Amino acid sequence: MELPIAPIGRIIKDAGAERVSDDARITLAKILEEMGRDIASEAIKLARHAGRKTIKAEDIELAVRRFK
Amino acid sequence: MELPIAPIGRIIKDAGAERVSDDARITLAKILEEMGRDIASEAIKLARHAGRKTIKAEDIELAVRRF
Amino acid sequence: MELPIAPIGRIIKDAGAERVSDDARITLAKILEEMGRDIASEAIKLARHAGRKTIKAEDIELAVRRFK
Amino acid sequence: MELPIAPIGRIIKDAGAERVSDDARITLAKILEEMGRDIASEAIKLARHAGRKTIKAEDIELAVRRF
Amino acid sequence: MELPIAPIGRIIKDAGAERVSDDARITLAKILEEMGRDIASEAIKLARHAGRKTIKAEDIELAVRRF
Amino acid sequence: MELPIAPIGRIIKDAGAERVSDDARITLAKILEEMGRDIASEAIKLARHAGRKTIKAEDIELAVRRF
DNA sequence: TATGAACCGTACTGTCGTCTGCGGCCTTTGATTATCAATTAAAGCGTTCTACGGCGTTTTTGATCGCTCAACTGTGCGAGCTAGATCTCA
DNA sequence: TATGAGATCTAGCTCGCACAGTTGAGCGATCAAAAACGCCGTAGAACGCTTTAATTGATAATCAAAGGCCGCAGACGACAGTACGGTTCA
Ligand SMILES: C[As](C)(=O)[O-]
Ligand SMILES: C[As](C)(=O)[O-]
Ligand SMILES: C[As](C)(=O)[O-]
């Protein structure tokens, strides 16, 4: 669990939530981290397909146009 | 930009990336934050529909199954 | 409708079908052609992400590695 | 090899490809043929589950909802 | 949450678990219930495709093939 | 057969089934129980690998990512 | 990874509450026989679009070079994670 | 509407995110020889179309069976409250 809980809680709060449960925060944390991992994997596959070793923003933006 | 860059960089690195550009990190940050905001909004609408004011984990888990 | 109907009908026949409706054949034709177009499009985006303009088998296998 | 190569090449061309390798055409051919076989099999099982022996469009459209 | 927790806990116990967390029991409960709902839906689609209104064991056994 | 039939029947009913055969209920029961046993076993092996003896929800959530 | 150590947080015994399970009768739906049209297979026709090169040529993909740029030490001020009290919904 | 349940708030104690050069490396460039795709006219093997004709999938109606619903005795899942073996800290 690399992602911190507090900023995500602040996200849910900024979304319009009066009160936010810790379970919701941790859940959204694990979910967002999961999506991050998947998108990262796709971007890596893309960059590796592009003959490059460094992950650029292009790889992320292209990998994100395929769910998740 | 509520989400920090370093942990996300650690995510991309743990995914199998030898080197990661800062632009990629910031991009993935904005993307994850966007998804977070949207999902949070949906969960808020669900919980508000459920007669509750506090966002519980069920609201999140149900909201993510609406993408 | 780029794809011919008869070979696809022969595919359904080779699958184990005693009798095959024409509606089923044309339907499967439109479906397979649709899938083909989608996969081709994805492979094109992948190759275009690369330094190439020509679509190679790698692009096809990678686009099919992320589903139609 | 039930499927012809040329129409599929024309499909890739209609997708927006300037130049297309033969390997890509044959690969996409084998892939589309594979999917065709799988969907056909599923549709056959579907119709066989029913009181019919003939494969109708309904069976295909229902079998394709299994990816 | 239609499914009870205790029998599932007994399942995990019969699997070879010395001690079982309640979170694990509830998790496996919701998961198994989810799978049950999905399989039930598929079986319903199957029986409705078969021109019948009653869900028979055939529909379940065929719906569980997805897999 | 650790799992009860009635709640599963209520699941199939909640899925949209007008009428449900008892054979279908028992079948889905045995299926869900089977999946439960397999997933439980996998989770047990997972927890046994992690240096813990107690099965937590994490082990289940990781075991279900094998299907 | 090994030594403990404080503390979650289980297994536990036992009690209460609900839920299943089951046999009752009934109502509806499941196959089943029989009829009858829908339609799909089989063959044979004509015509098209396949597959196959031969060359001309766009396009790769080699190799080598500055060159931005990401990783990686160390630092300070920021940021989250925690513990406890108070209330606000659940 | 009564009560745990639990989320917000306050404060502070760390924790790791942010940052600034430094060093080294992967990246985009520059042409360049060569794989390799496109073009296109040719021979031919297909797809398509169509009528014969029989197998089939509906329709209709009668029969039997098989869930649904109701209600009851008994099973067992849920729920505190308490010693402790286990987990996750250091
Ligand atoms: C205090 As608020 C912005 O989470 O409603
Ligand atoms: C040759 As083209 C214009 O169909 O990509
Ligand atoms: C005693 As056991 C098989 O439930 O761990």
b or e along C26-63 (b: 16 or more beta carbons within 10 Å of the residue's beta carbon)?
bbbbebbbebbbebbbbbbbbbbbbebeebbbbbbbbb
Q: In angstroms, what is the resolution?
A: 4.0
Q: Nearest CA to CA, how far is C55 from chain A (Å)?
A: 13
Q: What is the CATH number of the domain that holds A64?
A: 1.10.20.10
Closest CA to D16 of C66, C47, C2, A67: C47
Q: Count Cα neighbours of A29 within 13 Å in the Cβ-side half-sphere.
A: 18
Q: Which of A18, A21, A25 to mutate to test the pocket of ligand 1 (most atoms within 8 A of CB)?
A: A18
Burial of F47 (0-12, 13-18, 19+ CB in 10 A): buried
Token pair in block for residue F60:
């289940």
Token pair in block for residue A58:
């292009």
Query: Rounded CA gap, F47 and F53, in Å?
Result: 6
Closest CA to D55 of C23, C62, A35: C23
- How far is the CA of A53 from the CAs of B3, B27, C61, in angstroms? 26, 18, 21
DSSP run (H or E) holding D13: helix D6-15
Range of the domain at D4: 1-67
Query: Rounded CA gap, B24 and A57, in Å?
Result: 4
Residue E37 CA, chain-centre distance (Å), reads 7
Residues across chain B:
67
Please report the beta strands in C15-65, taking only residues with DSSP state E, as ranges in sequence order: 19-20, 54-55
**C8: helix, coil or strand?**
helix
Query: Rounded CA gap, A66 and C41, in Å?
Result: 13
- How far is the CA of A5 from the CAs of A9, B25, B41, E63, in angstroms? 6, 19, 17, 40
Q: Give me ligand 2 centre to Cα D15, in Å.
A: 8
Dihedral of alpha carbons C3, C6, C7, C11, sign: positive
Query: Rounded CA gap, C22 and C24, in Å?
Result: 5
Dihedral of alpha carbons F32, F38, F39, F41, sign: positive
Residues in contact with E52: Cβ distance below 8 Å, sequence separation at least 6, in sequence order: none
Question: Which residues on E lie below 8 Å from F15 (Cβ)?
Answer: 37, 40-41, 43-44
Token pair in block for residue B44:
């808020």
Token pair in block for residue D8:
């599929």
Q: Which residues of B touch A (CB under 8 A)?
A: 2-4, 7-8, 10-12, 14-21, 23-24, 26-28, 31-33, 35-37, 39-41, 43-44, 47, 53-57, 59-61, 64, 67
Residues in contact with C24: Cβ distance below 8 Å, sequence separation at least 6, in sequence order: C12, D43, D55, D56, D57, D59, D60
- Residue numbers preceding breaks in chain F (C to N > 2.5 A): none
Q: How many domains does chain A fold into?
A: 1
Residues in contact with A20: Cβ distance below 8 Å, sequence separation at least 6, in sequence order: A9, A12, A13, B54, B55
Residues across chain F:
67
| Phi then psi dihedrals of residue D18, to 5 deg | -65, -50
Q: Which residue has the tokens 């709902």?
A: E37
